[PDB]
Design a protein around this ligand. Structure first.
Ligand SMILES: [Zn+2]
Ligand SMILES: [Zn+2]
Ligand SMILES: [Zn+2]
Length: 313
């Protein structure tokens, strides 16, 4: 049965109906070039469609099976199920809220989410977040937007959003971070992240993994403390023997980070057989291949075809 409350603003009124799911939307809340005809898939269903399409799925998703994703979603639910999320951990009981089903046509809770994930019902992170969002929508409808429960539901979704985003950035990093085995941060990924010197305004030059590029910013994960930041691409250099010098007050901390990095370099060398340090102050460029070149003096020869076409919880 279709919902009566707009998925965007959580209010009733004249609402559009999705063909593919029970969500409904005020035309106005969608900021359209014009209202639809006849075939309309909502923005949630559009997103999920674009994502679960083999040829336009994300690096993360192309890497992942449904089953592998379900294992990762299990970790994400554990993050969502923090202390103080009591109200949303099990289905709302009718004994306490006898009129709940007059307002809420599509109940959801964290336990249901977990069971659904285990049953391999989610084909992508997008589908998981969209389903989790019923918790927040429902809470706002029934309790009110300013109710204290809504604060808690908002945090649950913000946690979900963060976790989904992290899976999408790199599922292998995510799994590593979840299990926290020793030197998890030194374990190379199947498509290894470039090592850079990264300088954030206000901070000393520091070793990091470059996880992605977006609009001239690099998603840098720093050795040592395992902090993170977007770093301007022009402030990122490929890793070199010579260190770009910064005054600092944290000498043992820097040493620890450099130690960690050298383990990582040893691991990359072990797993892929190469690692190329670059000349001092070599700009990092998007999707940099340099560190993996067979012969760094011959970029046209590229990386070594060493894959055997082969394919940890
Ligand atoms: Zn609306
Ligand atoms: Zn839909
Ligand atoms: Zn990774």
């Amino acid at each position: 049965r279709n919902d009566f409350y707009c998925w965007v603003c959580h209010r009733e009124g004249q609402v559009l109906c999705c063909e593919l799911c029970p969500r409904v939307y005020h035309a106005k809340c969608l900021r359209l070039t014009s209202e639809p005809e006849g075939d309309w898939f909502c923005p949630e269903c559009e997103k999920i469609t674009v994502a679960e399409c083999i040829e336009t799925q994300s690096k993360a998703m192309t890497m992942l099976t449904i089953e592998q994703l379900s294992y990762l979603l299990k970790f994400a639910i554990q993050k969502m199920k923090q202390p103080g999320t009591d109200a949303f951990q099990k289905p709302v009981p009718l004994e306490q809220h006898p009129d709940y089903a007059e307002y809420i046509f599509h109940p959801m809770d964290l336990c249901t989410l977990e069971k659904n994930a285990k049953k391999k019902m989610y084909g992508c992170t997008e589908a998981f977040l969209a389903d989790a969002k019923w918790i927040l929508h429902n809470c706002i409808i029934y309790n009110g937007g300013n109710h204290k429960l809504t604060q808690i539901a908002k945090v649950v979704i913000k946690i979900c959003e963060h976790e989904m985003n992290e899976i999408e950035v790199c599922p292998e990093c995510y799994l590593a971070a979840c299990q926290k085995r020793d030197n998890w941060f030194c374990e190379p990924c199947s498509n290894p992240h470039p090592l850079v010197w990264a300088k954030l305004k206000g901070f000393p030059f520091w070793p990091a993994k470059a996880l992605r590029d977006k609009d001239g910013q690099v998603d840098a994960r720093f050795f040592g403390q395992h902090d993170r930041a977007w770093v301007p691409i022009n402030n990122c250099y490929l890793m070199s023997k010579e260190i770009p010098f910064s005054v600092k007050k944290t000498k043992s901390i820097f040493n620890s980070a450099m130690q960690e990095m050298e383990v990582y370099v040893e691991n990359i060398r072990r797993k892929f057989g190469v690692f190329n340090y670059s000349p001092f102050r070599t700009p990092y460029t998007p999707n940099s291949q340099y560190q993996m070149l067979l012969d760094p003096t011959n970029p046209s020869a590229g990386t070594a075809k060493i894959d055997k076409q082969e394919k940890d919880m």
